[PDB]
């Protein structure tokens, strides 16, 4: 496969400070294209990517309505959730939703997703068959019964197999110059003496898109997994990402180390070494 569209919705109750805040951001791969916040002066689905701006008034209205409705539904679910767990009305709780579809290079459905987490813990999820559910506990089983009784999975499947894949294919076409362009990482190795005895070799990867990348250090061709410090891939802010892997090596042994970079925008994976 090669592409995904996904919505990340967060509903957080805040007793004594109004109704639960709802925010939904939509992404095509690692590119955000829309956002919605119930706390905005006038909540509406708004563009966060150039290629989505061409969508008409009808698109913005329908999605604004969908999210205003999801805001109301998550507020109702947070209330239900509190009861399922015998929790008081005084605490703050979070309900997150993650849904969408992945398509292969040919644009056909690879897989659909529709899952929920309550207070950071998986709650219920539509199985890969788009027909059944996995409930994490007895409270989620209540949600499962209700969804099964209303034949909810059939609707989700209809969205994930049709509407969802259709939108993603349309977004991919409209934003092909960026969405379908892989920017390979610009790479280099820095060297930082620690003492007379050791030095840090840090291997950099910058300016790459999409975020998926693997940086590994080898000493004498042997991977140094346990001895490598790896930071989390981080957004540079211009749509691209950055990452680095470091290893503390004995002074004079730097040449026994090689960094290997794998990224889809690279024809072949790179091998680098500190060049003094």
């Amino acid at each position: 496969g090669s592409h995904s569209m996904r919505y990340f919705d967060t509903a957080m109750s805040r007793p004594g400070r109004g109704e639960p805040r709802f925010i939904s951001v939509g992404y095509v791969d690692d590119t955000q294209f829309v956002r919605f916040d119930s706390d905005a002066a006038s909540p509406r689905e708004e563009p966060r990517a150039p290629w989505i701006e061409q969508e008409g008034p009808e698109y913005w209205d329908r999605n604004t309505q969908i999210f205003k409705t999801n805001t109301q539904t998550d507020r109702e679910s947070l209330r239900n959730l509190r009861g399922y767990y015998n929790q008081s009305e005084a605490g703050s709780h979070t309900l997150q939703s993650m849904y969408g579809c992945d398509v292969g290079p040919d644009g056909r459905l690879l897989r659909g997703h529709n899952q929920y987490a309550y207070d950071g813990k998986d709650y219920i999820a539509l199985n890969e068959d788009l027909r059944s559910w996995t409930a994490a506990d007895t409270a989620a089983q209540i949600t499962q019964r209700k969804w099964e009784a209303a034949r909810v999975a059939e609707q989700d499947r209809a969205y994930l197999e049709g509407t969802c894949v259709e939108w993603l294919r349309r977004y991919l076409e409209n934003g092909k110059d960026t969405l379908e362009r892989a920017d390979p990482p610009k790479t280099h190795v820095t060297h930082h003496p620690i003492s007379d005895h050791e030095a840090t070799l840090r291997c950099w990867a910058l300016g790459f898109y999409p975020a998926e990348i693997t940086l590994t250090w080898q000493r004498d061709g042997e991977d140094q997994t346990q001895d490598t410090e790896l930071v989390e891939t981080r957004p540079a802010g211009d749509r691209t990402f950055q990452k680095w892997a470091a290893v503390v090596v004995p002074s004079g042994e730097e040449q026994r180390y090689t960094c290997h970079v794998q990224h889809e925008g690279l024809p072949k994976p790179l091998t680098l070494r500190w060049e003094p």
Binding site: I66, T73, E76, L81, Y116, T143, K146, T163
Partner: peptide, 8 residues
């Protein structure tokens, strides 16, 4: 485009 979800 998003989808109207269901109450838990």
């Amino acid at each position: 485009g998003g989808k109207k979800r269901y109450k838990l």
